[PDB]
């Protein structure tokens, strides 16, 4: 059924699964027209598709040209997501296809189920968790690759960099969501925290800096202080 805090460890078992987050697929800027009316200018998007076990991110770049001439774009976006996820499954060798796909928004259930009717043995599931994957476009290299794209393009990342050499995937996942939650709540402060120390660099093949274990502890703590903070600044507590 649905995924929640009780069956939280199932994300890290050896059953292949993918999270799909569709919140950044259809992105616009809203602006005034010369006539003083309002209009949207779409910008490039991405589908955020992640194996939480391995850290593998299949970042499907959605160029604005896919919206040309289409109506009801927000609806089409969910169908476009489903089609792309389904094309991703079909292109993977069988022993690589997921046994479950978790959608971070319930509205994607039916589009994906309909696109995956050929894969009856793949469980399409919702989740109760409030995952911050929407903040993915606060990761500079990812954002950069979406915004530069001139055509439809799929790009492969490991969202955990080399973390799994030193920590488990449960802990990797928890670090990730804590960073993304922080970026989502106060992007500037979050970004300030991650780069305050110019001696800690991001390898060319990574997304996040090369922190020691002790430095990640310090980092993780500052991100919690931030999230707790903004929760006060927000609710006055």
């Amino acid at each position: 059924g649905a995924m929640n805090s009780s069956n939280y460890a199932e994300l890290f078992n050896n059953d292949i699964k993918l999270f799909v987050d569709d919140t950044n697929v259809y992105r616009v800027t809203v602006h005034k027209t010369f006539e003083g009316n309002v209009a949207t200018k779409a910008i490039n998007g991405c589908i955020f598709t992640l194996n939480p076990k391995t850290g593998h991110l299949f970042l499907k770049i959605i160029h604005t040209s896919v919206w040309a001439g289409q109506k009801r774009l927000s609806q089409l976006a969910k169908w476009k997501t489903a089609e792309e996820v389904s094309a991703l499954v079909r292109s993977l060798p069988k022993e690589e296809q997921p046994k479950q796909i978790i959608v971070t928004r319930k509205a994607m259930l039916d589009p994906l189920e309909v696109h995956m009717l050929d894969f009856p043995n793949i469980a399409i599931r919702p989740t109760e968790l409030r995952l911050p994957f929407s903040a993915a476009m606060s990761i500079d290299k990812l954002s950069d690759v979406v915004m530069k794209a001139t055509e439809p393009q799929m790009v492969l990342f490991n969202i955990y960099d080399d973390w799994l050499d030193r920590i488990s995937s449960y802990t990797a996942f928890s670090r990730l969501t804590l960073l993304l939650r922080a970026l989502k709540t106060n992007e500037e402060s979050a970004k300030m925290i991650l780069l305050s120390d110019p001696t800690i660099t991001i390898k060319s093949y990574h997304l996040w800096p090369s922190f020691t274990d002790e430095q990640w502890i310090t980092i993780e703590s500052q991100m919690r202080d931030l999230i707790l903070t903004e929760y006060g600044r927000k609710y006055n507590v």
């Binding site: 169908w79 089609e83 589009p111 309909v114 696109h115 009717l117 050929d118």
Partner: protein
């Protein structure tokens, strides 16, 4: 005018004949039902005074044989039978009619209700949905499951309605996923109408038979079928005009007939608000919508 004679009524029971029902008392001198309008399909149905559990009854056409009801005390029910000796059935039925032991099918002459409810219902089709080929009548009860309900257990006692599933490969063409889920026209017109039903009259007949088994027997799987075949039209942006107009007539009479006190279990709130207010056909069922708003504004 034709007759369903009864050998006796050993057990107290509420008999229904079409939209009519009357109480028979245990061992009351009752010998049956007379004056049954030729030319329609009929249902004669039972609810025992002692165990309201299990409504049951028989679909029949009088043109298709001479039919009597006799209580079986081993199986504990009123059973329909056929008498092939036509001479014998005439003389048996005449004797009960002379002794005035039969109630009369009480049709009001202004009343087209039964016709508007069975317009596309044909015995030959009923017998394919209800498979028991050695009899010319067809038995139903509240607990028979449908073929689709058995996929989600006895196949001989099932209701073989047409399977309709909006998220199936049958319903969705590769490459038209979003198109075909949001506008079910392909599935209504090409798959079901042209492919399986052949025409709209076969489709409405199953729809009407579905509905009557829900109403008369509280058969849940027939209600599911009745609703699905509504939703499939209402969700198709392209429907022949004559089907919409006939659909508005069909449903309207179904809504009018439905017991006021049974709407909470027979009417799917979601399907009906979708069909009348959201769907492609939200403006095409004026009669059905006006009756539904005036009789069951709560559901909406």
């Amino acid at each position: 005018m034709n007759t369903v004679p009864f050998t006796s009524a050993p057990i107290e029971v509420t008999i229904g004949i079409d939209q009519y029902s009357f109480n028979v008392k245990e061992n009351q001198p009752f010998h049956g039902i007379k004056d049954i309008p030729i030319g329609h399909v009929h249902v004669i149905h039972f609810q025992h005074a002692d165990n309201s559990s299990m409504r049951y009854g028989y679909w029949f056409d009088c043109r298709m044989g001479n039919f009597y009801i006799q209580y079986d005390p081993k199986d504990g029910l009123y059973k329909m039978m056929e008498e092939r000796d036509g001479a014998k059935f005439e003389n048996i039925v005449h004797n009960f009619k002379e002794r005035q032991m039969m109630v009369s099918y009480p049709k009001i002459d202004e009343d087209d209700t039964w016709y508007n409810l069975t317009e596309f219902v044909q015995m030959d089709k009923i017998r394919k949905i209800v498979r028991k080929d050695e009899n010319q009548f067809s038995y139903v009860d509240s607990s028979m499951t449908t073929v689709q309900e058995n996929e989600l257990s006895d196949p001989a006692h099932s209701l073989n309605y047409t399977v309709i599933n909006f998220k199936s490969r049958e319903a969705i063409r590769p490459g038209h996923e979003m198109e075909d889920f949001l506008d079910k026209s392909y599935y209504l017109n090409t798959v079901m109408l042209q492919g399986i039903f052949k025409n709209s009259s076969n489709y409405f007949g199953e729809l009407q038979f579905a509905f009557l088994n829900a109403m008369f027997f509280g058969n849940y799987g027939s209600s599911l079928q009745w609703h699905a075949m509504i939703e499939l039209i209402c969700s198709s942006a392209t429907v022949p005009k004559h089907m919409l107009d006939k659909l508005d007539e069909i449903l309207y009479y179904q809504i009018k007939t439905l017991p006021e006190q049974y709407s909470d279990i027979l009417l799917n709130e979601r399907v009906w608000n979708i069909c009348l207010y959201s769907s492609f056909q939200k403006n095409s069922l004026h009669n059905t919508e006006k009756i539904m708003e005036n009789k069951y504004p709560e559901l909406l």
